[PDB]
Amino acid sequence: MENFQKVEKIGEGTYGVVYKARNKLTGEVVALKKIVPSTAIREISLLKELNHPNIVKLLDVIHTENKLYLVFEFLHQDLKKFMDASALTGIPLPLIKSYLFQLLQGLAFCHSHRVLHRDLKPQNLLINTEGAIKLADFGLARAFGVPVRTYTHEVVTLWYRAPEILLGCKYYSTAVDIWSLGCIFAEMVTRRALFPGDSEIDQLFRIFRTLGTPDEVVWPGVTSMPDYKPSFPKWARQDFSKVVPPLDEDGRSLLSQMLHYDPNKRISAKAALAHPFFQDVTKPVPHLRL
Numbered sequence: 001m002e003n004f005q006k007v008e009k010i011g012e013g014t015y016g017v018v019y020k021a022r023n024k025l026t027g028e029v030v031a032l033k034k035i036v037p038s039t040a041i042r043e044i045s046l047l048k049e050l051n052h053p054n055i056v057k058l059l060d061v062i063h064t065e066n067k068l069y070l071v072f073e074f075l076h077q078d079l080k081k082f083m084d085a086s087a088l089t090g091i092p093l094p095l096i097k098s099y100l101f102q103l104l105q106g107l108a109f110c111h112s113h114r115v116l117h118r119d120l121k122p123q124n125l126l127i128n129t130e131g132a133i134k135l136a137d138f139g140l141a142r143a144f145g146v147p148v149r150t151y152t153h154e155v156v157t158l159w160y161r162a163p164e165i166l167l168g169c170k171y172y173s174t175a176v177d178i179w180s181l182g183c184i185f186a187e188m189v190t191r192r193a194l195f196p197g198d199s200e201i202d203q204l205f206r207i208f209r210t211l212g213t214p215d216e217v218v219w220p221g222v223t224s225m226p227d228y229k230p231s232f233p234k235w236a237r238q239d240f241s242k243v244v245p246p247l248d249e250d251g252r253s254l255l256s257q258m259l260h261y262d263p264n265k266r267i268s269a270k271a272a273l274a275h276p277f278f279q280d281v282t283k284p285v286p287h288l289r290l
């Protein structure tokens with residue numbers, strides 16, 4: 001670990017704090033994540049081989065005196081920040097479509113290898129000036145865990161949590177990542193969080209008010225779910241046209257499929273790549289201020 005020279009507190013994730021570091025030898029710039037059971041070690045170590053242009057490369061893993069340091073390739077900005085920096089004008093559709101396409105690409109890769117992110121969010125998507133967007137902290141949720149809180153003396157964000165997780169499902173699948181990406185997608189379009197809940201019940205109810213209270217009709221087995229309460233208010237489904245304006249019909253169609261209540265009905269990353277919405281997909285360059 002004495003091989004790096006901390007440069008600045010780049011972040012403060014749920015696993016631990018993140019610093020920008022300079023490998024004293026190669027001089028390469030990396031993102032140093034200081035965070036353990038051997039199980040985790042095998043887990044976060046298998047990730048070292050999961051490489052993809054849209055996945056933030058996990059350079060190395062340093063476990064010294066029960067201190068877990070994760071070294072990732074460095075990117076100068078996350079989407080949350082770019083999104084805030086594009087607040088007045090918003091991100092150009094072409095760029096939105098390119099980012100989702102690449103993210104769907106990263107997801108398809110991870111999912112084909114049976115790896116889930118489990119906690120996608122704007123702060124976990126990093127961009128470079130090349131017009132590239134990558135998934136950060138991938139597979140780090142299973143490798144460890146994810147409580148309502150943490151040591152960072154901070155609050156978790158459930159804004160992007162799929163309903164099956166909120167309803168008590170313990171064996172959720174890759175479909176939770178698609179739900180999360182759907183929320184981010186809607187957020188890139190509206191420049192406003194889709195379901196900014198402040199508690200699990202508020203989170204679930206904001207979803208309910210927009211997509212309608214799920215029942216056995218649209219979600220077979222939903223009432224069997226652990227945290228399902230026959231007493232949930234019965235909300236009507238609000239037309240999607242009112243959810244993500246002014247996204248066009250192709251996008252609203254893709255989004256609605258990424259937000260299906262039934263995980264099994266929810267569109268897969270691989271299948272989303274063949275959606276008409278990306279028929280005219282390109283790769284524009286963003287304008288970043290570093």
Ligand SMILES: Cc1nc(C)c(-c2ccnc(Nc3ccc(C(F)(F)F)cc3)n2)s1
Nearest residue numbers: 013031072073074075076077078081136137
């Ligand atoms: C949480 C994170 N986990 C990883 C692996 C992260 C990472 C890896 C490489 N680069 C970056 N860059 C970055 C750049 C700017 C910001 C901020 F805070 F200004 F928005 C936040 C993050 N972050 S952030």
